[PDB]
RNA sequence: UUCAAAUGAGAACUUUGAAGACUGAAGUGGGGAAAGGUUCCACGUCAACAGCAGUUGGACGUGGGUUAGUCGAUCCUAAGA
């Protein structure tokens, strides 16, 4: 899965920051999940949907 | 065949010129053909107690005589290479001298 | 020495997670031609020179 | 010691029931390791098939510097074709280079 | 067995060497168990492991 | 090859009324 | 690390090797709502930052524990 | 062997399970039927207070005179596809909450703990005395209430393969007891059946269940069985503990391959007087299935950073099951306090929430419940560290899933028998071949599954009891007769649904089910069944 | 150096007990500086290495572990740069 640019880019700021805190817990306990699971494929999508963010945010 | 005696082992004669720290291991293999050649038995066991008695007196002061009680007992073991095997105890005597080979009653 | 710097505890640092045998599932790998680590490193073999 | 032998009582309880004559109940790892515990070496292949046809790979590719008695993957040791010191002697009357 | 870490360990507890340090030869399972510092005084309590007294340098003579 | 000859067979193979209770909570 | 928890009210953490105590002490209190007591902090050989965080008698660590989901 | 104590203990056992049955029963009416009671219990506080009522009640049972007694099977609630191992604690629902945010609703009642209407709700509990072991699970539904009607009941019976599964479970349970009731009097079973002058056989078994679940288009669960019961040995953890004597009758993801292509359990017995049996059987629903396929189950895990899937259910389970063979010293003093709360428990599976001082409740508090919380957090850092030597471990939950013959077929393993789970924590489903006749193992299936676009949850009906085969002298009426501890007509009664599936009458299998079931309404020369009764409690 | 038991397929060399000795406080004890860099400790474990052996290891595999207002650096200046 992952976050889409261009549903991003019709967002205000606000939302914007909304969704990258979220985002930023969402990893957060992705991590404490890591520690017993070494395999957990959804912290790359969540990383990646962190970066789009901040992307957008920045343009 | 189960049996037990006591006998005298003059170590006098068996450590007469051996190296002084030679002497209480070379009195323990002494003993071992001892037994085997009394008791037919390859397996030879010592008591820790007959150790003692052994290596009392230092590396280098073995008695002359040790009074010995010797059992030949059976192998228990189902994975025994051999059926009997020898008990050696010490004796703790008086004194070993003029002591003969007597036959203990096993009780 | 035990008052380090620590320049020298991060290199160190880096030397202990360096310090591995190859993961076996780089192995399995189509057309996989590494076998083993050919720079591993122990303390009493290859002194890593400050 | 009558009274004490017979005081100290044992009763079969349920654990003594199921668990008596079995054990494990838990697959023994590899590496010895714990629940949480990380394996570096194997938790990139899940199957055991895999895992003993790498082990066997690896196996097979150690034969070599196992056959030259290397420590390990970490003895890199190399040897000079010739030293100079070994190969450079002409002694004089004097001073020599050794004893 | 294996009980070079319970000796170590008893003697760290007891607060003697490990020369004054005695493992009873019959309860080898049952040292063999004891990882933790806890479990070696639970064992010293119960008699499995002893101190052992020191030995005499007598001064009758001097 | 006898798992052939199994997963042969295998797709060989594969290719009113009652009332219980009435109106009440029992 | 989890014997802290029980012992004396502390939880560890892996932190960025960029932050100080303060920093520690101001995220703790801010993502968990905790008051902190002290922070005493290591760098572990390798490389990265571990942090034993103190809370005051008036929260419990074993509540933390148990929200953040290791226990 | 039968005596007057062991039957009178396992009599007492079967009492306290059938009040324990009644108390929860009345409990979901009052929440979701009668709706008397303001306010709706949830799942977790159903299965708190069932626990609370059966210590309660066991408390003045065989006080001072038995060594061991307690809960046997804690109680559990499965919602539609789930088909075992629901017990969540009470303070584990915000965390089932922030777990399955963001997720389908299709656990949505297992999520929040609220039933919903059409439920298919699954109430299994067990209680042992002395290791004597009486279980009983029921199916129940959960209706809307009609606001017409001047008495309360269902607007409309229960319709569609959930009613099918219900049939299939409640008529598969009376056919099973009547059969096995009928080795006590062996003359007594039709012809038709099988030999009049030869007993009871798990092949009569088997095909007799096999064929009522065909008749009702319904798949046996994996986890179903007909196994006799001994002292300790009930199969209160069949999957996990392995067992030196098995005497009964399985099935499995194996048995469906065989039937499709037509210490390890054989069905090639015959039920002897004087033995105790545990009957449970799971049926799945197969009306969505348009081909044929294979019934299997799937383990819920409480990490939701393994896949993508808004269909899937995280959870953590509640039942943990402590190996006594297994011996660690711990180092924590919390762990160690709850390791030797463990041990008094015995060998039974167990929640938390049982080894709370505070349990069972004395009066029902906000006090009481905030205790049992404050426990239960020292309760779970204990367990984290006993759970991390391999000291104790859980209990599965398991959802049924089905699976297309044709991708089993079409798909490929490079491995055959050689592979399986080196990750899997336990030895038994870890090396285990679901398909042994195709080379699969359990770790290539789950793959398959998973890899599957067309793999669906089917719903799942329960029904479990046990009984006793008393003889002559063992029996009050001086012939053999069967004593169902748990279940029958005052208990386990029947929801209302209709089926358009029914059995087909012009078989011999089928007229062998209606002669037993003739036989069984005979109480003049048929057989005798003394059902168990649930016990006044004001 | 010796005896018995345990472990193990296999024990002169591993572990515990039983003995005999030795370092003899300018130690074969207990800590540090330079240097090394995880060698510390636990679990697993023997192909290679430990010039015999090996079930043992500073070896191989997987992990755990170093918490400071008061101890140091940090501040001062020396020869000097
Ligand atoms: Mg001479
Ligand atoms: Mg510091
Ligand atoms: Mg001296
Ligand atoms: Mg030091
Ligand atoms: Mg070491
Ligand atoms: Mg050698
Ligand atoms: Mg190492």
Redesign the pocket.
Known sequence: AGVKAYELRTKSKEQLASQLVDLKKELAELKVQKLSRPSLPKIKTVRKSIACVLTVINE | DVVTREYTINLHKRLHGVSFKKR??RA??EI?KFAKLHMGTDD?????????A??????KGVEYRLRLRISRKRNEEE?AKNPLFSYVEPVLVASAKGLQTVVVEED | ????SFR??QK?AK??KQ???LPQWIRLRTNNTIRYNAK?????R????? | QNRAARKNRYVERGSDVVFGDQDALTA???????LR???????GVADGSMRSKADRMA?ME??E??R???????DRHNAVSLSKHLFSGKRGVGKTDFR | ????????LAASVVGVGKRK?????NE?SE?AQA?SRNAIRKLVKNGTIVKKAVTVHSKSRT | SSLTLVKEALWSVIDQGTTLGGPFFP | ?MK?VEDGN?L?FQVSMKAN?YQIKKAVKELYEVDVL?????????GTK?A?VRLTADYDALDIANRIGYI | ILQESVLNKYRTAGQIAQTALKYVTSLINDSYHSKTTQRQLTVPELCLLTDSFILTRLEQYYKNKVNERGIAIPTTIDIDQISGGWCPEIDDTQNLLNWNKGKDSTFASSVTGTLRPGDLVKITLGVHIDGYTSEVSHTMVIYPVDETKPILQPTGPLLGGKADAVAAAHIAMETVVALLACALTPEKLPASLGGTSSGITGQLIRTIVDTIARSYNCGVVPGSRVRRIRRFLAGQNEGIVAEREYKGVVWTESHQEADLLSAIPSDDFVVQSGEVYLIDLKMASLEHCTKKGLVTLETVDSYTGKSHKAGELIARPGAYVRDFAQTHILKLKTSRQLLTKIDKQGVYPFKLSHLSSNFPFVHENEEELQSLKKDLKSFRLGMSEISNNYLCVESPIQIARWVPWDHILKATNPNGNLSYDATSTLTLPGHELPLPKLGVSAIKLKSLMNSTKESISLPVARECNTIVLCDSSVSTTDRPELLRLTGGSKTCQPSWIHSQHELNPQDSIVQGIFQLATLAKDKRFGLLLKETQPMKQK
């Open positions: 209480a291991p323990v293999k071992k030879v066991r010592l008591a820790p107690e007959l150790n003692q052994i290596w009392k007196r230092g590396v994975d | 020495a035990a008052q380090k020298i505890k160190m030397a202990k310090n591995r045998p591993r490193r122990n303390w009493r290859t002194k890593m020179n400050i | 023994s790892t590899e590496n010895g390791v714990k515990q990380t394996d570096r070496l194997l938790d196996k150690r034969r510097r196992n030259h008695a290397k420590q390990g993957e970490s | 067995a294996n009980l070079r870490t319970q000796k170590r340090v005695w493992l009873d030869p080898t040292i990882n | 690390a802290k502390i560890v105590k002290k922070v005493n902090t290591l760098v572990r050989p390798n571990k034993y």
